[PDB]
Amino acid sequence: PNRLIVDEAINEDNSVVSLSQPKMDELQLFRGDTVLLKGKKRREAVCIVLSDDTCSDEKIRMNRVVRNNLRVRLGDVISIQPCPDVKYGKRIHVLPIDDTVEGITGNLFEVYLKPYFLEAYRPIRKGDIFLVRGGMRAVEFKVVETDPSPYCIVAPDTVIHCEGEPIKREDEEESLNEVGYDDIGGCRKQLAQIKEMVELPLRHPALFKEIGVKPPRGILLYGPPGTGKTLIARAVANETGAFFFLINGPEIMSKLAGESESNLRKAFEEAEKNAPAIIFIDELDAIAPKREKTHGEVERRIVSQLLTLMDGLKQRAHVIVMAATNRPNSIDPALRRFGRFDREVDIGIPDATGRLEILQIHTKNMKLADDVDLEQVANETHGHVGADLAALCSEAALQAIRKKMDLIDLEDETIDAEVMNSLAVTMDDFRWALSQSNPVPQVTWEDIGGLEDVKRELQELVQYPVEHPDKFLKFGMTPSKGVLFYGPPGCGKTLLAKAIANECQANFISIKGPELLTMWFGESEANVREIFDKARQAAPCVLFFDQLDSIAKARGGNIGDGGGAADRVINQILTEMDGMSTKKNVFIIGATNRPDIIDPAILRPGRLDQLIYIPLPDEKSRVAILKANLRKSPVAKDVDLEFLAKMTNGFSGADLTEICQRACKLAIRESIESEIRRERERQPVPEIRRDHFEEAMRFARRSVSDNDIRKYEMFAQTLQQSRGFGSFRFPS
């Protein structure tokens, strides 16, 4: 009930806040009562609570001045509690902000403070920043001293004086600039994990104490540079009330030996004093590198003293340490031993949506053109790091400046304000920056011609189960992961595998049989294990085994020198496929020219259960193949694909592709000679003609003989007879 959402004010001044009447009844708050408001970064403010009929129950109406006071924005969560025993002020000291009084030479008291506090009984607190209208410009003040402290009421007899050194602008700017974890984007999973590891132990030490578990001593964050590790740490610290203390590694090593020890000891003592506290050590590898890889005892004693203090954490004062490193391995393992920096967090490259959020947050201060879109920039920037994205934005801004150099006068000492405000960064600047800045198979099924039965078999086998996992769970049958293709060479078996992998949008790894053989004792099986492990890492993936007949043979039928090595390779393949049986996502496809010598254990169900025969394409498939081949070729309409297909009934698809490439090349040569002849006669050929087609046809030859087809059909018939059973019918 105390927690309330920050909402815009209607008529609220810097000294009043508004709550709904039912919430007042729930919180037992009376109108005119003074309350204590708590915000982010241990910011406190006091105001008078008033009733508004249009205020939401879960929201509190709050103006910009108090929002700056509590370092919270619209939509944030703040806590409101009664503030009793607030006495009348005796003497209050307020000092102006430098940028608010530049050129203001009048009496600050009479002009601003006296009308503001006149008969209003405004509650104030030390450190409060309040803006008062008056004179020729509004002026902000900071409450630096109060009596009593920190809460007092500005009474008619309260002494208000503003003499003294004005508060520096830079000190005030630093607090205002820093905000919560809304700065970071795309790491809300990592942000939630860091919240769970950090803020919960800090807020509730007793929760860990009762069970008997010890809260984490340290947290370590690693990742590529520019991932906002220090940014995310400071941001997650800002949301929580826990104090954030920052330690800089170059600062520590810049100090002389021993003095840095005192500095870090004092840092830890101050953190223990300001419980709850968060210790962040930026660039931990800098202060404490690997102990063995050192040329000096100074860094060694740094690491040793750091270990002593890490063991010296109270864990009843509810303070923990975090650090960010570019390379975790550079950190000495002693710092990473159990009980010190035990919980280990990885920060990767931000995602596309996270990168879009990073662009939007970066460009919020930017004046941005309407035409430019950040979404397409995020899509193009697939791997750029958030720091690289900021550099991209800066480069685009400088490109906009370069575009606007002509309109402005660089020689002039003062630039025109009209051109400056009319300046905006367009899509062209972003494109120029993208050009300057630096950080699945391609075969689609339309490429393949025919094999529609093999098509539907491939979709049902591979594409279908991922589409409906619930249906498979209902049926309870795991999907098969093995397909074997056997047929004459050049029939698109590799094309079919690429097509299925492209359709399912998964990684594709293709390995050749003889590529893995090697000549050493254990190397072949090591290569097989390596490719299977690579398929594991790239899961989901499709593994294609070309020329499976070479890598897999009948184990019994080999009495040569290499028979033992071949048998060992087959056994390794069998064991690796048994291992693959665990992983559903990994798919294995095998292609062989001749399947007669394939080991029967390979053909066992569970490894390569699905056997699909790829025959020589028929007439319609051949027409489709020719059309796909000339999809990229401007072929004349006089050329008829129907006759070119029907003539070569026995030619394979590879021959068709070679013929099409040859015809395209001959069209190229005809265009070349026509253009050269035109140039010569000065001092054509839009499409390929039929003549080049027929004079290219004669060089082509039948790739596959009839005997290979006879053998393949005999093997298929042997499998057809194996199926048998006719139509199986249960009794009755």
Ligand X SMILES: Nc1ncnc2c1ncn2[C@@H]1O[C@H](COP(=O)(O)OP(=O)(O)O)[C@@H](O)[C@H]1O
Tell me the helix, strand and coil percentages in the chain, rounded to 5: 45, 15, 40
Instruction: Give the C-alpha separation, 162 to 150, whole Å.
Output: 18
Q: Which residue of 216, 218, 441, 449 would you call a contact of ligand X, by CB under 6 A?
A: 449
Residue 563 structure tokens: 């028979």
Interface with a second copy by CB under 8 A: which range of 295-303, 425-433, 442-450, 717-725?
A: 295-303
Interaction between residue 489 and ligand X (CB under 6 A): yes
Distances (CA, A) of 286 to 250, 326, 335: 7, 10, 13
CB 168 within 8 A of CB 100: no
Residue 580 structure tokens: 């693959």
Nearest-approach distance from CB 656 to a second copy, in angstroms: 43
Residue 287: count of CB within 10 angstroms of its CB: 24
Interaction between residue 564 and a second copy (CB under 8 A): yes
Instruction: Give the C-alpha separation, 631 to 109, whole Å.
Output: 84
Q: Pattern 224-263, binding to a second copy, x per CB under 8 A?
A: ------------------------xxxxxxx-xx------
Interaction between residue 68 and ligand X (CB under 6 A): no
Q: Is 225 annotated as a binding residue?
A: yes
Residue 226 structure tokens: 């520019």
CB 153 within 8 A of CB 88: yes
Interaction between residue 249 and ligand X (CB under 6 A): no
Query: Strands 129-132 and 139-145, how do they pair?
Result: antiparallel
Interaction between residue 628 and ligand X (CB under 6 A): yes
Interaction between residue 386 and ligand X (CB under 6 A): yes
Task: Identify which of residues 270 and 618 has a Cβ nearer to ligand X in the complex.
Answer: 618
Q: Is 644 annotated as a binding residue?
A: no
Instruction: Give the C-alpha separation, 116 to 167, whole Å.
Output: 20
Which residues does the chain break after (C to N > 2.5 Å)?
439, 683
Number of residues that bind a second copy (CB under 8 A): 54
Number of residues that bind ligand X (CB under 6 A): 34
Q: Which residue of 578, 619, 673, 695 would you call a contact of a second copy, by CB under 8 A?
A: 578
Interaction between residue 529 and a second copy (CB under 8 A): no
Q: Which does 461 bind (CB under 5 to 8 A by kind): ligand X, a second copy, none?
A: none
Interaction between residue 366 and ligand X (CB under 6 A): no
Q: Is 383 annotated as a binding residue?
A: no
Nearest-approach distance from CB 644 to ligand X, in angstroms: 14
Interaction between residue 185 and ligand X (CB under 6 A): yes
Nearest-approach distance from CB 283 to ligand X, in angstroms: 8
Q: Which does 562 bind (CB under 5 to 8 A by kind): a second copy, ligand X, none?
A: a second copy
CB 40 within 8 A of CB 67: no
Q: How many residues does the chain have?
A: 732
Q: Which does 338 bind (CB under 5 to 8 A by kind): a second copy, ligand X, none?
A: none
Instruction: Give the C-alpha separation, 438 to 547, whole Å.
Output: 41
Three-class DSSP labels, 367-430: CECCCCCHHHHHHHCCCCCHHHHHHHHHHHHHHHHHHCCCCCCCCCCCCCHHHHHHCCECHHHH
| Footprint on this chain of a second copy (rule: CB under 8 A) | 170, 248-254, 256-257, 286, 292-293, 295-298, 300-301, 304-305, 307-308, 311, 316, 520-522, 546-547, 549-550, 553, 555-558, 560-568, 571-572, 574-575, 578, 593-594, 601
Please enumerate, by residue number, every residue annotated as part of a binding site for ATP.
225-231, 326, 362, 490-495
Please enumerate, by residue number, every residue annotated as part of a binding site.
225-231, 326, 362, 490-495
| Footprint on this chain of ligand X (rule: CB under 6 A) | 183-185, 187, 225-231, 324, 358, 361, 386-387, 390, 447-450, 489-495, 591, 625, 628, 653-654, 657
